[PDB]
Amino acid sequence: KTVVVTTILESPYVMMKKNHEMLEGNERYEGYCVDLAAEIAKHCGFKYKLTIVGDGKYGARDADTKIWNGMVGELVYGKADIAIAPLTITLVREEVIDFSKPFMSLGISIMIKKPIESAEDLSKQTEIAYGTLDSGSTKEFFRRSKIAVFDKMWTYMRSAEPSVFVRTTAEGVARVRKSKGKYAYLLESTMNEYIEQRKPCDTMKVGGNLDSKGYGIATPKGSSLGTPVNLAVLKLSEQGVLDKLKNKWWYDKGEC
Amino acid sequence: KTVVVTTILESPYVMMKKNHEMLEGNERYEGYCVDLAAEIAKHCGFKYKLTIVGDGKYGARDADTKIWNGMVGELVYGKADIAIAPLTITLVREEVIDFSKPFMSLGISIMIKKPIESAEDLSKQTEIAYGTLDSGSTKEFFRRSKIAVFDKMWTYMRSAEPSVFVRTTAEGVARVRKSKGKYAYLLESTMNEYIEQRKPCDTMKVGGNLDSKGYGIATPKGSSLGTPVNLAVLKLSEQGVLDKLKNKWWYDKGEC
Amino acid sequence: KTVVVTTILESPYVMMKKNHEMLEGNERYEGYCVDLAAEIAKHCGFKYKLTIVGDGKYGARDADTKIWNGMVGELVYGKADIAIAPLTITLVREEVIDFSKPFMSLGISIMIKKPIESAEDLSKQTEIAYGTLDSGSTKEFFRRSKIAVFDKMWTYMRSAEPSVFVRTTAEGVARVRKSKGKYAYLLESTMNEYIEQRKPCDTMKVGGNLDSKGYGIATPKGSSLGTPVNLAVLKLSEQGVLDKLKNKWWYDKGEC
Amino acid sequence: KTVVVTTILESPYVMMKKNHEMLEGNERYEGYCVDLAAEIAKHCGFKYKLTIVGDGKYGARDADTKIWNGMVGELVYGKADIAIAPLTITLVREEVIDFSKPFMSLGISIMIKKPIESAEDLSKQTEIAYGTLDSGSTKEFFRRSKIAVFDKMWTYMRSAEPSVFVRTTAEGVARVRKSKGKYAYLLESTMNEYIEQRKPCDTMKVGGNLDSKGYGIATPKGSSLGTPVNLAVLKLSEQGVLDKLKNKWWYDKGEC
Ligand SMILES: NS(=O)(=O)c1cc2c(cc1Cl)N[C@H]([C@H]1C[C@H]3C=C[C@@H]1C3)NS2(=O)=O
Ligand SMILES: NS(=O)(=O)c1cc2c(cc1Cl)N[C@H]([C@H]1C[C@H]3C=C[C@@H]1C3)NS2(=O)=O
Ligand SMILES: NS(=O)(=O)c1cc2c(cc1Cl)N[C@H]([C@H]1C[C@H]3C=C[C@@H]1C3)NS2(=O)=O
Ligand SMILES: NS(=O)(=O)c1cc2c(cc1Cl)N[C@H]([C@H]1C[C@H]3C=C[C@@H]1C3)NS2(=O)=O
Ligand SMILES: NCc1cc2[nH]c(=O)c(=O)[nH]c2cc1[N+](=O)[O-]
Ligand SMILES: NCc1cc2[nH]c(=O)c(=O)[nH]c2cc1[N+](=O)[O-]
Ligand SMILES: NCc1cc2[nH]c(=O)c(=O)[nH]c2cc1[N+](=O)[O-]
Ligand SMILES: NCc1cc2[nH]c(=O)c(=O)[nH]c2cc1[N+](=O)[O-]
Structure with a gap:
């Protein structure tokens, strides 16, 4: 069989x-x-x-x-x-x-265009925007998180104009590459590294993982x-x- | 019951x-x-x-x-x-x-006295010595490996005078503290972070995990x-x- | 007779x-x-x-x-x-x-257009491309080589766009001549020296032999x-x- | 059996x-x-x-x-x-x-203390002395060499005061390490590299091999x-x- x-x-x-x-x-x-x-x-x-x-x-x-x-x-x-x-x-x-x-x-990581080296630094500032998918494991993690850092990150994202959420990972990567360093993407670390090792090689992974999966x-x-x-x-x-x-x-x- | x-x-x-x-x-x-x-x-x-x-x-x-x-x-x-x-x-x-x-x-990490930010940086140079527990899972991993980077690290470790291996993790961290930046210790990442958060806070964890456990x-x-x-x-x-x-x-x- | x-x-x-x-x-x-x-x-x-x-x-x-x-x-x-x-x-x-x-x-040597002093210098960087013939002893040697340096050169060669492999050694030396320092050729040392000593004398032999025949x-x-x-x-x-x-x-x- | x-x-x-x-x-x-x-x-x-x-x-x-x-x-x-x-x-x-x-x-190479990069450079100058064994294959090679450069090196060695010949390889290495860069040693390339890779690491091999064995x-x-x-x-x-x-x-x- x-x-x-x-x-x-x-x-x-x-x-x-x-x-x-x-x-x-x-x-x-x-x-x-x-x-x-x-x-x-x-x-x-x-x-x-x-x-x-x-x-x-x-x-x-x-x-x-x-x-x-x-x-x-x-x-x-x-x-x-x-x-x-x-x-x-x-x-x-x-x-x-x-x-x-x-x-x-794997875990949730930060994607930036090739100033930020941790999630805490991302939470402190406001010049650089960041967002996740409109629905999924990462957004659910941020919505339900009780840690103060991720709580304030979720509070900013829920109260950000224009909306920082993207419909697909490709859309998020495109926005990161077209935002000339003024947007960050939160996504799985494996996909982050994969995209980091693709042409035209303009993105990078910064900091550690926000969680573990x-x-x-x-x-x-x-x-x-x-x-x-x-x-x-x-x-x-x-x-x-x-x-x-x-x-x-x-x-x-x-x-x- | x-x-x-x-x-x-x-x-x-x-x-x-x-x-x-x-x-x-x-x-x-x-x-x-x-x-x-x-x-x-x-x-x-x-x-x-x-x-x-x-x-x-x-x-x-x-x-x-x-x-x-x-x-x-x-x-x-x-x-x-x-x-x-x-x-x-x-x-x-x-x-x-x-x-x-x-x-x-967790994983295998590098502990040094608080440059070098990866295992390959350690492998390239020889001014800073690095060591591993006398007999344990990390030593077994270094001996039995396929990547020539870890094979080279292991070969340097076995052929080195004085021996870089240590009896216990406490003796290894003591050697790191007393070596004023000349000796590095390889151990589990969780214990590395725990020692990093302990007094007198003279140690630090650099790079990422070599393996995954x-x-x-x-x-x-x-x-x-x-x-x-x-x-x-x-x-x-x-x-x-x-x-x-x-x-x-x-x-x-x-x-x- | x-x-x-x-x-x-x-x-x-x-x-x-x-x-x-x-x-x-x-x-x-x-x-x-x-x-x-x-x-x-x-x-x-x-x-x-x-x-x-x-x-x-x-x-x-x-x-x-x-x-x-x-x-x-x-x-x-x-x-x-x-x-x-x-x-x-x-x-x-x-x-x-x-x-x-x-x-x-003789042995396998590196031919470049006339920095790099050896084979590991070629292996480290990726600015200059290098490739062997489409077949022959050099390809087999790079295929079976268990050394990290030669294995990584073979990895670079098999996965490269455009293809670095050459149909004939004459086309390889022509590509080296026309590449103005961007492409390197791997061939027998005797032929390398012979071509070096011929007009227009725009090529040179660098480093040492990789193997021994x-x-x-x-x-x-x-x-x-x-x-x-x-x-x-x-x-x-x-x-x-x-x-x-x-x-x-x-x-x-x-x-x- | x-x-x-x-x-x-x-x-x-x-x-x-x-x-x-x-x-x-x-x-x-x-x-x-x-x-x-x-x-x-x-x-x-x-x-x-x-x-x-x-x-x-x-x-x-x-x-x-x-x-x-x-x-x-x-x-x-x-x-x-x-x-x-x-x-x-x-x-x-x-x-x-x-x-x-x-x-x-292997072959005949030049040993110097860690100005000279080939045999012809050694033959051109006279500040640095050079010598081989008092009785061996290298001295015989230099004695009956018909090439012009090796002929003039042999002429210099024959009519040299004090004598540049040594009784043992260890004596030649010691004389190289003692004459603070004012003496060169001609010996087998394998032994040259071996001594180069030993403590106190003050000698090095320069140039190519003068012959083939x-x-x-x-x-x-x-x-x-x-x-x-x-x-x-x-x-x-x-x-x-x-x-x-x-x-x-x-x-x-x-x-x-
Ligand atoms: N941050 S951590 O080291 O305390 C840590 C590490 C891990 C956690 C949870 C935490 Cl909090 N869960 C994962 C588990 C969850 C599901 C996915 C992998 C296993 C099954 N294993 S893990 O990757 O070993
Ligand atoms: N793809 S990887 O190199 O990061 C990687 C990741 C992992 C590996 C092994 C490798 Cl090679 N093994 C662990 C497994 C081993 C034992 C401990 C945790 C699980 C059970 N899971 S893991 O932590 O998800
Ligand atoms: N690199 S080395 O000195 O250890 C070395 C030197 C030599 C090797 C192989 C090695 Cl690994 N094989 C050749 C042999 C192979 C075939 C061609 C010449 C002899 C027959 N002899 S060699 O040119 O004396
Ligand atoms: N200088 S060269 O390349 O023309 C060259 C190369 C070689 C020569 C002689 C010369 Cl002239 N002889 C040796 C032979 C001599 C004795 C020692 C090794 C073989 C048997 N083989 S070799 O190392 O392949
Ligand atoms: N291989 C990455 C990847 C893996 C996933 N695994 C899942 O079990 C899932 O429910 N959703 C996933 C989305 C992605 N993705 O498109 O980033
Ligand atoms: N970090 C706690 C720790 C946990 C361990 N668990 C094991 O199954 C083991 O074989 N060895 C360990 C060593 C240590 N150690 O002292 O670093
Ligand atoms: N004369 C050099 C030379 C000699 C060779 N001898 C061989 O037995 C062979 O199979 N292939 C060769 C290729 C070359 N070459 O063109 O580099
Ligand atoms: N290098 C090893 C070595 C090998 C030798 N082989 C011989 O057949 C020989 O007649 N004399 C040698 C001298 C030496 N030596 O002491 O340098």
């Missing part, structure tokens, strides 16, 4: 190769998660077939219908056997499915792959394979 | 109260892990009794008898029901006990507390409780 | 004389290898007839027919009795023919000419004749 | 271990040639016993008795099976024994180990093991 691996199209995790039209099968894709899936299969000795999620969403439960969609929905309704992709380990997902130990740590390999609740997959993730972390894969797809392939 | 919690005496995770001679029970202890245990017990609704591990070790399997010691030994052999301590999540430990999601992210809450294999404890950690992480506890015992109670 | 010598037309080893139409026999050719053949024949006391290999190839085994071409194919299949040419001593060739002690030492006199396996030719090569090396011939065709006849 | 591997006590090729008195067998020694012998044994799958030559000589034929001594003598009279040591491939030795392809290329593994005339040993040497050269071994015992263990 071939293991159905559900993934998502996100760079540099899973992306189509340049000559993907000629190729077929698992050779159509490449990226960090493709190598991770290959290593996981090698450790556990199974045959897998990569599949891009049709919905194109990471996974959430609709309020009115209580129906999961995306990768989490595919795992819940038995449409896939494993999800090797940057899926964030959250409470509701852990309630509905199984997560392995995180294979990549992780990407975990997801397995259906009650499946037999959970323990071997978790052990494989720990083994890959301990031999440093995950460090090498991160360096390859972020800095070795960087264009800066 | 009262849940027995095994723990180790390590500042600031668990510290003995100043007036503990006249105190009894769980009121004798304080620290980050004590507050974490209180939060976990409140979430899961059980009564617990904090106990300190007899041998004062985190846990390892001897190559001679295949016998676990420390908190891992207490967990596998039925002595304790749960371990709430800075216990690193490792493959050999995960094969014998259940680890929850990490509640603290985590501290997890451990339960015996097949225990009924594994699932509720894992969900509690995720709940406390997303509400900022773990962030608040980290600041309270690292910065709010600092002496610098 | 006249000894058939197989050679390859390559400056300055074997070059065709200016008035070669009016000449016939061995008087048609001149170069370092012609003088070496004269010395070897004088030492071993035999008459020889210089011939140019038909396909103009040094020698390689076909991956599909296991058939040797070039001068190695000439020697193996009984066509020629000895090869006196810049034939690199390799493991695959030594299994099928006999190599004398090397008469020329050698050119040897080749003889069919199990032949009576092996040991006398090896002894002749050693005697000429210890008498300075090989040094004298190297200077004559590289510097005494240079155009710079 | 174990293989007797004769060798010489020369650094960094073969030297006694720091705690060699406690140890016994092949673990008693260490060095570049020890690792080379280990790799050669691994390639050919034989068991070997390292022995230091009693005479402490590399090998030469007496003028009167015409009896070889040293390592060459041990090989000739059947007292050893292979010589894995820095033995120079010369004409008389190749007439008497078998040599493999060189595993290390090589170190070869020696095998008795007519033995069956010659071809496999030669193939092993070529294989080690092509994979880069010889480069790695040289870098380890010269630069990775250097004290400068």
Whole structure:
């Protein structure tokens, strides 16, 4: 029985190769998660077939219908056997499915054009604007935060004219690059570093992470792959394979 | 039934109260892990009794008898029901006990007397010597590595007179303090920050983490507390409780 | 019996004389290898007839027919009795023919348009591009190299836009000439010095050799000419004749 | 039938271990040639016993008795099976024994205290004196050199007061370190680099090599180990093991 691996199209995790039209099968894709899936299969000795999620969403439960969609929905309704992709380990997902130990740590970071070196410095001043998405984990973190620094950051953002929120990460990066140093973007650190290593190389990551999260390999609740997959993730972390894969797809392939 | 919690005496995770001679029970202890245990017990609704591990070790399997010691030994052999301590999540430990999601992210960092802002800056020069614990996870990581930067650092460390390795982390920090800027110490980032926030505040942490590890809450294999404890950690992480506890015992109670 | 010598037309080893139409026999050719053949024949006391290999190839085994071409194919299949040419001593060739002690030492060197003093200086910066041939020993050496410096050069070469690889060495030197100090070429040290000593004298050899190879006199396996030719090569090396011939065709006849 | 591997006590090729008195067998020694012998044994799958030559000589034929001594003598009279040591491939030795392809290329270089960057610069001036061994291969090379520059250097050395010749390499190095930049030493490039990478690190190698030589593994005339040993040497050269071994015992263990 071939293991159905559900993934998502996100760079540099899973992306189509340049000559993907000629190729077929698992050779159509490449990226960090493709190598991770290959290593996981090698450790556990199974045959897998990569599949891009049709919905194109990471996974959430609709309020009115209580129906999961995306990768989490595919795992819940038995449409896939494993999800090797940057899926964030959250409470509701852990309630509905199984997560392995995180294979990549991340957090909320600050993006500026290549004056600010910390979140506290951003909160103190008012010349430089900053914002997040109109909805998502980062905005929810800022809205609910009880720490004084993040509380005043959220108070400024909620009371900023014009609105500092952006509809998509691409819009935020574009505003950062077009604001000539008068706007800052708050986003995941992994995406921050990835964009930092892209042309035209005009953005940079400043300061530490405002919080801590992780990407975990997801397995259906009650499946037999959970323990071997978790052990494989720990083994890959301990031999440093995950460090090498991160360096390859972020800095070795960087264009800066 | 009262849940027995095994723990180790390590500042600031668990510290003995100043007036503990006249105190009894769980009121004798304080620290980050004590507050974490209180939060976990409140979430899961059980009564617990904090106990300190007899041998004062985190846990390892001897190559001679295949016998676990420390908190891992207490967990596998039925002595304790749960371990709430800075216990690193490792493959050999995960094969014998259940680890929850990490509640603290850490890594290998550089400690110097308070330029050099990265490990490659240390590697390039040789005027400033750097060292590692005599026998531990960090020394194992430096010896067993694939990146030639860390391989070069390890090669310099083994072929160096006098030996840069130190018996204990206390001896390493003492050497850093007495070396007036000539010697650097490599250790866990959490302990690095804790020492940085301690008197006489002559040390500082530079650069980022070389690797990525985590501290997890451990339960015996097949225990009924594994699932509720894992969900509690995720709940406390997303509400900022773990962030608040980290600041309270690292910065709010600092002496610098 | 006249000894058939197989050679390859390559400056300055074997070059065709200016008035070669009016000449016939061995008087048609001149170069370092012609003088070496004269010395070897004088030492071993035999008459020889210089011939140019038909396909103009040094020698390689076909991956599909296991058939040797070039001068190695000439020697193996009984066509020629000895090869006196810049034939690199390799493991695959030594299994099928006999190599004398090397008469020329060489290696991989850096050619730039005339700062950088070595290979690590090239590897560190990215302002100046560098690339090897599309195939050959240099590409394989950079591929298999486990050294950090050479591995990072190989990483830069494989992932580079536009492609730094070159179809032919003539196009490589042309690209170096036209690049006005922006592109560097990696090739054999002997050819590097030879091109340096030719007009318009706009190139220079910098740094030192990266690897170590050698050119040897080749003889069919199990032949009576092996040991006398090896002894002749050693005697000429210890008498300075090989040094004298190297200077004559590289510097005494240079155009710079 | 174990293989007797004769060798010489020369650094960094073969030297006694720091705690060699406690140890016994092949673990008693260490060095570049020890690792080379280990790799050669691994390639050919034989068991070997390292022995230091009693005479402490590399090998030469007496003028009167015409009896070889040293390592060459041990090989000739059947007292050893292979010589894995820095033995120079010369004409008389190749007439008497078998040599493999060189595993290390060396030459004559200039040693100065840390004004001169080549041999012609040394020949042009007269402020800095230069000398070689009172009796050795370098003095013989200079005595019968037909090149003009080496001829005038030999003329200067022959008619020089006080005499510039030395009785031992250590004496030459000491004279270089004592004459405060007013004396130059001509010696093998490998030894030059070795001394350059040792305390107190006051000498350096300048310019290129004046000639070309090589170190070869020696095998008795007519033995069956010659071809496999030669193939092993070529294989080690092509994979880069010889480069790695040289870098380890010269630069990775250097004290400068
Ligand atoms: N992608 S990375 O180099 O930053 C990275 C990140 C992480 C790694 C390993 C690597 Cl290489 N392992 C840890 C795991 C190891 C054990 C401790 C925490 C989890 C269980 N998770 S992590 O902190 O998310
Ligand atoms: N700021 S910190 O070091 O105290 C810290 C570190 C970490 C936290 C929470 C905090 Cl507060 N939670 C994460 C967990 C949450 C979910 C995503 C990764 C694991 C599962 N692990 S972590 O990245 O090791
Ligand atoms: N100066 S050069 O490149 O023309 C050159 C190069 C070399 C020469 C002689 C000369 Cl003149 N002889 C040596 C040979 C001599 C003895 C020692 C190594 C081989 C056997 N090979 S070499 O190191 O490849
Ligand atoms: N860099 S080094 O001195 O350790 C070194 C020197 C030499 C090496 C390999 C190395 Cl790593 N191989 C060559 C050999 C390979 C083939 C060509 C010449 C001989 C046969 N001899 S060498 O030119 O004497
Ligand atoms: N791979 C980055 C990334 C990862 C995500 N993982 C999730 O589980 C999620 O719900 N949303 C995400 C958004 C992004 N994003 O577009 O920045
Ligand atoms: N930082 C607390 C700490 C926690 C540890 N947990 C472990 O599982 C371990 O094997 N070694 C540790 C060392 C330390 N230490 O003293 O730095
Ligand atoms: N004469 C130099 C030279 C010699 C070579 N000998 C070979 O056996 C070979 O396979 N390729 C070569 C390429 C070159 N070259 O053009 O750099
Ligand atoms: N450098 C090693 C070294 C190797 C040598 N090999 C020889 O075959 C030799 O006749 N004399 C040598 C002298 C030395 N030396 O002491 O410099």
